[PDB]
Curated annotation (Swiss-Prot), chain A:
Residues 283-308 are annotated as: Disordered. The rod domain contains six 100-residue motifs that appear to have a cross-beta conformation. Homodimer. F-actin cross-linking protein. It comes from the Eukaryota. Filamin repeats lie at residues 1-96, 97-198, 214-288. This is Gelation factor. It comes from Dictyostelium discoideum.
Length: 308, 306
């Protein structure tokens, strides 16, 4: 029970793709039709954008272990013959891919710059190959360890963007320092690791208008800006206000100022007089909050302040 | 002469004052004539006793004076040989005499005046007894001098109650000597120096700048105590001129200071990290939309902090 060319396959990781300095293994399974223990007709040759002498470490039972490691290139032909016959696998062609580079690959994003404690930090890893070019696709094993305040671990989420890019996300609940180490093949890649600062983070949507100020520039009978004060200055705000505080100030230099902290739900109208006459565009209307969720047991009063 | 056809006339037999001379003249007729005889007699009955001085005449006229000393109502008899003359007895009301040491003036036009508005005060006539005059017909006068020895005419009105309203124009800044008089004597606290100042013209004035300041809060519901946050300010509208500024007061407060000149309706977006605040946007209205430039197409002015 000498061999069969045909009913005897071959299989393995490495007759399916490749990588620049990584070993490419596969296994021959000799059959007659069925079964097997160490006859020796098989022979492998590999031509491609290099030379490649492949080892056929061979036999025991009717199996054979072949390995070759491509030295950086794309497509390789593999011919598997049995006593000068084509095994029921071949000829067959694999495509070897370049190899990513530990310090030819970097990361950018606001995630390695400056992080708030109430919004997710982002950034991208950039995959370069051995030579210099940038990786087309993915399947490269990059890793991301995050160690923040109080040493504690932070679980980053790496997303294979199928190009030679991977997206990174993480949450930094506490203000503190965060060490972000991004290794390739367990080797800290471009300028990795690196500290990152996270600070307390304003929360827009729940954030409040405090105070307001508007200034008038008093005009005299000539049509020029006055240069001292002295005029009667009255500011009237009218609306619904769980709270108010208003100010009518004579900045004693030609101008008058109103300073007020107003809070409520609705639309508002402020009357402004200089010597008992409205200024150009008084009153003026505006709106803060929402006239809905607004209280019922609210009046709509009129606050007044006057200056000497 | 005869009682019926001869008649008296004059000021003082028509009304009176206190410490003013009441004067009237008698015309003896026969019918139609007169030269002296005598026959005429006068006595005043009143709240106080009075002695009329009658100056008998050249031609058939008489001159009688009698000034009323205390005041109200006085009766004037006029017999001729014991025979009421054809208008008698008569009734005259002496009113109290205004005093220049007890009448006084008040109004903001004695305090502080603007060069762009009429100044006003009131006179309060007080009588010689220190009782507020009741009614008018008092000859109070007003002399105002302005700053280059200019002359301001004041317009005095007679409130028909013992007071008199006054208005004047102090058209230039400087000082204004206000002097109110009564038959030549300055009333109490006169004259007075009044400072007039340059007046603001409200209807022609407007807004220069604007500011508002948000208290940033974190997630734990508290207020922050420093900055760091991206704070963005955006103004949309028909802006004819504008300047904006987003400021981190680096204490967890942010400020927007802007100067807007425009003719329409405006809204303003305020983002504490790419997320509108508890009112953003707030809409204000400025300048009449109908008068603006026929082409000012509203746009967006944006300014960012961090």
């Amino acid at each position: 029970p000498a061999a069969d060319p045909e009913k005897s396959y071959a299989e393995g990781p490495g007759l399916d793709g490749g990588e620049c300095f990584q070993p490419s293994k596969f296994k021959i399974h000799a059959v007659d039709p069925d079964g097997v223990d160490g006859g020796d007709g098989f022979v492998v040759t590999i031509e491609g954008p290099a030379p490649v002498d492949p080892v056929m470490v061979d036999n025991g039972d009717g199996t054979y272990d072949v390995e070759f490691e491509p030295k950086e290139a794309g497509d390789y032909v593999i011919n598997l013959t049995l006593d000068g016959d084509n095994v029921n696998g071949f000829p067959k062609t694999v495509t070897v891919k370049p190899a990513p580079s530990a310090e030819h690959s970097y990361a950018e994003g606001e995630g390695l710059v400056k992080v708030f404690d109430n919004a997710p930090a982002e950034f991208t890893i950039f995959a370069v190959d051995t030579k210099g070019v940038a990786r087309t696709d993915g399947g490269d094993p990059f890793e991301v360890a995050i160690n923040g305040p109080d040493g504690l671990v932070v679980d980053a989420k790496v997303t294979d963007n199928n190009d030679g890019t991977y997206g990174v996300v993480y949450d930094a609940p506490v203000e503190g320092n965060y060490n972000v180490n991004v290794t390739l093949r367990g080797n800290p890649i471009k300028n990795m690791p690196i500290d990152v600062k996270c600070i307390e983070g304003a929360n827009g949507e729940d954030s409040s208008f405090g105070s307001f100020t508007f200034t008038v520039a008093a005009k005299n009978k000539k049509g020029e800006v006055k240069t001292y004060g002295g005029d009667k200055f009255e500011v009237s705000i009218t609306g619904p206000a769980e709270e108010i505080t208003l100010d009518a100030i004579d900045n004693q230099d030609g101008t008058y100022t109103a300073a007020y902290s107003l809070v409520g739900n609705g639309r508002f109208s402020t009357g402004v007089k200089l010597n008992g006459k409205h200024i150009e565009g008084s009153p003026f209307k505006q709106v803060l909050g929402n006239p809905g969720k607004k209280n019922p047991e609210v009046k709509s009063f009129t606050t007044t302040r006057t200056a000497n």
